[PDB]
């Protein structure tokens, strides 16, 4: 109690934390600086002054998360904004950039230059990991620094922090579904390295979140600024419902014991209930069943593996807000006994579930407001041969027609490493055909 220091990289990753922080502030009623005049009130944390008093406190106020940006503008938005005493300026880092979307750049070429300063911050952040759980990290997964620097670093953190929890929060379209033929080239090498060195990753599909925003939530301007606030409101409806509230409050280690039951990071694909136009415009309250039916609504459920198919292992759904026992049992039970859902023949139980008891208390204006009920959703299908096959197919697909690997070798990466990684995806595709046909 409470959560645990949160670290943020990337253009979405820092702002996903910035929007979620606005929601901590909004729920707390916190002052930029003071002093806050209520007994006590919670959001960052359960104390409310010296501001933030985010468990982390005193000094010029010691921060409970860290932002590495490149822009003075986000720093002004803290320092002359709200957040001014809720971080101290010694940990507000603002740097310079040079862009590649290449693994080799991020890992090597700028990667061995910028590292030392931020390594000295990370060693201290590990030294003073308040909350004590582990690293919770935003990403920044498909860029140049994204793909290669996180290779370099995640292997470093897996090395030196082998008992420490590591939860990776990433935005990433489903494989081969993005337009560009070459785009898998830097990322499939990270996907190889994190095939060995990762065990938890929370995934959000960018194409699905953009269409959801365009038609379902029905927004005239989808922008990545609104997507940042959108996925920060998803992450908030996990994090502020399990942290210490009127809730069942599942420690993330015993949760990861459910996420990975068996060797290989068994990541689940993620989605949210009320990312729709009627909820946006303000809707009926809705029961425990009615809000699962909200998360069911067309395209809020992924069609990656086909609508109800792909050999379901389990689905995990996380019921925020006040809750009635009978109704929650109805909510999980009806999709299973109507049995449209294709499960694995080895185990079609579906007992994995989370429920929490605390209504949202935030002031209406964005995409999330004061409601007494919500839900977050995680799909696990065992027939995901398709993901690994579509990394291998899409890589070869530029190649089959013209040569191209030579450029990333030209950034300092090995040439046979790509052949082998493509092959490991195609190997893994076989292994996953085994689990997606099952016993």
């Amino acid at each position: 109690m409470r959560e645990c220091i949160s670290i943020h990289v990337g253009q979405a990753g820092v702002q996903i934390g910035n929007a979620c922080w606005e929601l901590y502030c909004l729920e707390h009623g916190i002052q930029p600086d003071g002093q806050m005049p209520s007994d006590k009130t919670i959001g960052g944390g359960d104390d409310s002054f010296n501001t933030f008093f985010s468990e982390t406190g005193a000094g010029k106020h010691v921060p409970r998360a860290v932002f590495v940006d490149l822009e003075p503008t986000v720093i002004d938005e803290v320092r002359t904004g709200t957040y001014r005493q809720l971080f101290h300026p010694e940990q507000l880092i603002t740097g310079k950039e040079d862009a590649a979307n290449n693994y080799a750049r991020g890992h090597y070429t700028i990667g061995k230059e910028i590292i030392d300063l931020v390594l000295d911050r990370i060693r201290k952040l590990a030294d003073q990991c308040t909350g004590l759980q582990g690293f919770s990290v935003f990403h920044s997964f498909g860029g140049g620094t994204g793909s290669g620097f996180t290779s370099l670093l995640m292997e470093r953190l897996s090395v030196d922090y082998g008992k420490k929890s590591k939860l990776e929060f990433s935005i990433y379209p489903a494989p081969q579904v993005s337009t560009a033929v070459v785009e898998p080239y830097n990322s499939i090498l990270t996907t190889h390295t994190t095939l060995e060195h990762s065990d938890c990753a929370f995934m959000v599909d960018n194409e699905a979140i953009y269409d959801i925003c365009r038609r379902n939530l029905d927004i005239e301007r989808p922008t990545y600024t609104n997507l940042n606030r959108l996925i920060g409101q998803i992450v908030s409806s996990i994090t502020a419902s399990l942290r210490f509230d009127g809730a069942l409050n599942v420690d993330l280690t015993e949760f990861q014991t459910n996420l990975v039951p068996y060797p290989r990071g068994h990541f689940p694909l993620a989605t949210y209930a009320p990312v729709i136009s009627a909820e946006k415009a303000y809707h009926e309250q809705l029961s425990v069943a009615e809000i699962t039916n909200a998360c069911f609504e067309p395209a809020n459920q992924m069609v990656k593996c086909d609508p109800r198919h792909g050999k379901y292992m389990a689905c995990c759904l996380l019921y925020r807000g006040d809750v009635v026992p009978k109704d929650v049992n109805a909510a999980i039970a009806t999709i299973k006994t109507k049995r449209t859902i294709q499960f694995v023949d080895w185990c079609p139980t579906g007992f994995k579930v989370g429920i929490n008891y605390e209504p949202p208390t935030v002031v209406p204006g964005g995409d999330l407001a004061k409601v007494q009920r919500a839900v977050c959703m995680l799909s696990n299908t065992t027939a995901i041969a398709e993901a690994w096959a579509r990394l291998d197919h899409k890589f070869d697909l530029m190649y089959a027609k013209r040569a191209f690997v030579h450029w990333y070798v030209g950034e300092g990466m090995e040439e046979g490493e790509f052949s082998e990684a493509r092959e490991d995806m195609a190997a893994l595709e076989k292994d996953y055909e085994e689990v997606g046909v099952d016993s």
Binding site: E71, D98, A99, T179, R221, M398
Partner: protein, 427 residues
């Protein structure tokens, strides 16, 4: 801040140069005599883009005022935005504009290299922030042909280690019968391909055809048309230094322009408009932007890639617009040009976008094309040559002012290699 220097070669490289300076200073709040009219963000940060603030809110240029002769410097120093700061920034020296490429690439080039280089070596080390150099050029006679090619060989020897981006205006590419000049002009191209890293070539007649039609005036003054180009350019360089998630930087942008390793040729196009500089309706929405890109006629340089493949592209936008209306429109306008962008990669797309307008413009953009199946250009240089190779009585000038024939046959071969490399890009 970026702190760019402009290198402007010959009378044509200065024409564009100048009709950029007025507008660029003005939008970043530098006032004609070096004072201040700012108080918007770029006219406070971004601001020292070609400038520095100094002496009680006056503006020293980072791109200093250099010219060759005094009456041209009188036009630069009367300004309007070129009067800014006390005498140290004003530089001029010698003179040129000659003929005979051989004379210009040797004897009559070397003294004028000598007059340029010392001040460049003194300036070049002394810029700390300097992210890269903007280059503009002239093909004016034996100086801008002969000497300009001699000069860039010395500049790139001197600086392999700097970012140099070369914009070049041309009289419509190789459209006119040419005497014995093909074996000289390929040797000029030879020296251009072995001393250039990023190239952009702009067609005078296409812009005059755009002037006759779109901009609704039959008179095509190129000092006016080089303003339009440059104030449009104002929307490009500063776009990518305003915030926005697609506004990429160095190492990405480099490989974005070169998908295949050998020297490319980029062509600027035109983008939102039905006019600029006539009407009170000039066009600006996402459909009106997509219409000139997915046309054919606005683009520069008479050597048509477009038939053989439609290859790679980028569009740099300024103005608030719906990002998914852009990508929805983009899906439909790309469903036009499909596989045949290069059928190794169905669909070639790239974009960059900033929320915040440019000038009295609500929305504007630019369009950039690249070069595949244009081999016709380098057949043509050979097809013109035939008559006054056969009836030749003209090679001996260029030769008796320092040339010789091995260089002509070595140049001819790279013109044929060019014909192959476009044949091979059509493949």
């Amino acid at each position: 801040m970026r702190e760019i220097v402009h290198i402007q070669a010959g009378q044509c490289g200065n024409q564009i140069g100048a009709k950029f300076w007025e507008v660029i200073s003005d939008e970043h709040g530098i006032d004609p005599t070096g004072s201040y009219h700012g108080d918007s963000d770029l006219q406070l940060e971004r601001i020292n883009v070609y400038y520095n603030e100094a002496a009680g809110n006056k503006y020293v240029p980072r791109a200093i005022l250099v010219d060759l002769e005094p009456g041209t410097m009188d036009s630069v120093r009367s300004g309007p935005f070129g009067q800014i700061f006390r005498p140290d920034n004003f530089v001029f020296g010698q003179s040129g504009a000659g003929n005979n490429w051989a004379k210009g690439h040797y004897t009559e080039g070397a003294e004028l290299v000598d007059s340029v280089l010392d001040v460049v070596r003194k300036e070049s080390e002394s810029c700390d922030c300097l992210q890269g150099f903007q280059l503009t050029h002239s093909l004016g006679g034996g100086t801008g042909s002969g000497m300009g090619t001699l000069l860039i060989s010395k500049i790139r020897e001197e600086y392999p280690d700097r970012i140099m981006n070369t914009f070049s205006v041309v009289p419509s590419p190789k459209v006119s019968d040419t005497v014995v000049e093909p074996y000289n002009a390929t040797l000029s191209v030879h020296q251009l391909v072995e001393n250039t890293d990023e190239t952009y070539c702009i067609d005078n007649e296409a812009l005059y055809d755009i002037c006759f039609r779109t901009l609704k005036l039959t008179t095509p003054t190129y000092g006016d048309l080089n303003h339009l180009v440059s104030a449009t350019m104002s929307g490009v360089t500063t776009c990518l230094r305003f915030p926005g998630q697609l506004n990429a930087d160095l190492r990405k942008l480099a490989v974005n322009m070169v998908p295949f390793p050998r020297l490319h040729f980029f062509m600027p196009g035109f983008a939102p408009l039905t006019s600029r500089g006539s009407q009170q309706y000039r066009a600006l929405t996402v459909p009106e932007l997509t219409q000139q890109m997915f046309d054919a006629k606005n683009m520069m340089a008479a050597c048509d890639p477009r038939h053989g493949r439609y290859l790679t592209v980028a569009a740099v936008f300024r103005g608030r617009m719906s990002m998914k209306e852009v990508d929805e429109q983009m899906l439909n306008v790309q469903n036009k040009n499909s596989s045949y962008f290069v059928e190794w990669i169905p669909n070639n797309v790239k974009t960059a976008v900033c929320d915040i307008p440019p000038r009295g413009l609500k929305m504007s953009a630019t369009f950039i094309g690249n070069s595949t199946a244009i081999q016709e250009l380098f057949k043509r240089i050979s097809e013109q040559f035939t008559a006054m190779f056969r009836r030749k009585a003209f090679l001996h000038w260029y030769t008796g002012e320092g040339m010789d024939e091995m260089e002509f046959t070595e140049a001819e071969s790279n013109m044929n290699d060019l014909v192959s490399e476009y044949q091979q890009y059509q493949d």
